[PDB]
């Protein structure tokens, strides 16, 4: 760990951990984003192991950890993010229109149960400012042969206020859709009024198709111009993922999987926040969503379940608790290709991705697996 750039660089323990015993959460996160915005984060200098590699269709994830949705909201630190060691970004969640959220105080942590419990409210600058700083990193990654692999989606909800979502989401596309690689359709915040009733499988279905369309409308329609559509890194139209809650009966979600396998969505993201935590004494007669490690079980759970009630055929974006190279080892053994992180950056910090990468890249080698496919899934049977 030597000299400041090194992410496990040992000052950045200590100031990560005088940080979550006396300083407020929003004064953290936006201390995080103010060195990101200044391209003073440290920096992993690591290539990644070719075994620890993974793939969604064609996107090829260089190491299997990206940073989940709701930490860069905006999109104005993705490249120093990124060159923490992470393969791949999920910004937003983006509505059409700006909007401040829900009041404050809304974020508590609980670091002896490495928990958060949230009420944000999809708070962002809009789409048309979002989308106007992931151009400015699509114009930079265009530059820098080092991001030129590297993974964008975007997650995409509604304006508190909208009576259709559908509008909005067809909004969202025809915006920055060009430069996403992949569009993560977000039914499942629990702070957003009504937003969860579209996990019903008839309006999730009619969802998922007017949102594929509106893709396969954007390149019908651009086709022949002299600047290329797809400004991303696939260059090709960005899959469609959709992110569900885990407050969900067996019935919804076996419904939910017979949706996704006709309607061909190309992963889920299992899962989002949960609500049925109780026993947090920090978080009593707190309002929203808990992430961290007590969200971890429950969500591998979802993932077996809905790894076999999709038979095995819509791949699987794991967030939920991962903070261990053997919690994300348990998530792709449950079904998940690919694991996100949220929680883990909070507590651990810097060293947050090259610590995990370390821990799987071991634990690959002492179960004596010969890459990381080959363990997607193997809980089963
Ligand atoms: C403060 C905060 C804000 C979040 N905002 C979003 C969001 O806008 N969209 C979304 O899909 N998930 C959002 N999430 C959920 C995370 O992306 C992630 O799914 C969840 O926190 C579980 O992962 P974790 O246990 O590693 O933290 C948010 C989570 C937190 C803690
Ligand atoms: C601890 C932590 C870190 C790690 C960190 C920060 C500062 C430093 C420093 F030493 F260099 F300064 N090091 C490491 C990033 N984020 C948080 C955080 O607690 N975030 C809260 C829960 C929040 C609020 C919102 C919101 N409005 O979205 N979203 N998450
Ligand atoms: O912005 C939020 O309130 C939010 C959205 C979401 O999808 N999940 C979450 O935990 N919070």
Same mark, same amino acid.
């Given at each position: 760990?030597?000299?400041?750039? *090194? ?14 015993? +006396? ?16 391209? =003073? ?12 590699? @993974? ?6 994830? %260089? ?17 120093? =993010? ?6 791949? %970004? ?8 700006? &909007? ?17 419990? !949230? ?19 699509? /114009?930079?990654?265009?530059?820098? /042969? ?15 206020? @909208? ?18 690689? +992949? ?7 629990? !702070? ?30 651009? %086709? ?8 991303? @890194? ?33 992963? #889920? ?6 609500? &049925?935590? *109780?026993?947090? /004494? ?13 969200? /971890? ?16 055929? =819509? ?24 694991? &996100? ?8 910090? #810097? ?6 990468? $370390?821990?799987? *890249?071991?634990?690959? +080698?002492?179960?004596?697996?010969? !890459? ?5 899934? $193997?809980?089963?049977?």
């Amino acid at each position: 760990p030597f000299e400041s750039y *090194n992410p496990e660089f040992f000052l950045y323990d200590i100031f990560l951990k005088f940080c979550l015993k +006396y300083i407020d959460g929003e004064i953290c996160h936006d201390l995080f984003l103010l060195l990101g915005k200044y391209n =003073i984060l440290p920096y992993d200098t690591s290539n990644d192991s070719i075994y620890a590699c @993974t793939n969604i269709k064609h996107l090829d994830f %260089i190491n299997p950890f990206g940073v989940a949705a709701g930490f860069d909201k905006n999109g104005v630190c993705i490249d120093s =993010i990124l060159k923490l060691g992470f393969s791949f %970004i999920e910004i937003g969640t983006i509505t059409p229109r700006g &909007q401040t959220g829900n009041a404050k105080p809304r974020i508590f942590r609980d670091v002896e149960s490495r928990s958060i419990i !949230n009420s944000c409210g999809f708070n962002n600058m809009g789409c048309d400012k979002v989308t106007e700083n992931l151009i400015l990193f699509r /114009k930079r990654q265009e530059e820098d /042969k080092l991001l030129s692999k590297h993974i964008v989606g975007v997650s995409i909800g509604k304006n508190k206020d @909208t009576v259709n979502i559908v509008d909005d989401l067809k909004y969202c596309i025809n915006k920055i859709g060009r430069y996403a690689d +992949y569009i993560a359709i977000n039914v499942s915040s629990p !702070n957003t009024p009504g937003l969860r009733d579209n996990q019903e499988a008839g309006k999730l279905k009619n969802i998922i198709l007017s949102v594929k369309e509106e893709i396969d409308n954007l390149e019908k329609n651009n %086709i022949m111009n002299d600047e290329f559509l797809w400004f991303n @890194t696939t260059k090709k139209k960005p899959l469609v993922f959709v992110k569900l809650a885990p407050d969900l009966n067996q019935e919804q979600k076996k419904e939910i999987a017979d949706v996704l396998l006709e309607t061909n969505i190309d992963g #889920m993201i299992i899962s989002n926040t949960t609500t &049925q935590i *109780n026993d947090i /004494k920090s978080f009593e007669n707190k309002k929203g969503g808990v992430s961290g490690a007590k969200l /971890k079980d429950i969500s591998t759970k979802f993932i077996c379940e809905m790894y076999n009630y999709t038979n095995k055929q =819509i791949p699987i974006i794991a967030s939920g608790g991962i903070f261990s190279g053997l919690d994300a080892l348990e998530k792709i053994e449950a079904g998940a290709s690919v694991c &996100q992180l949220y929680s883990c950056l909070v507590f651990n910090g #810097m060293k947050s991705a090259v610590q995990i990468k $370390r821990e799987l *890249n071991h634990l690959l +080698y002492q179960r004596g697996y010969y !890459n990381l496919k080959e363990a997607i899934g $193997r809980k089963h049977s």
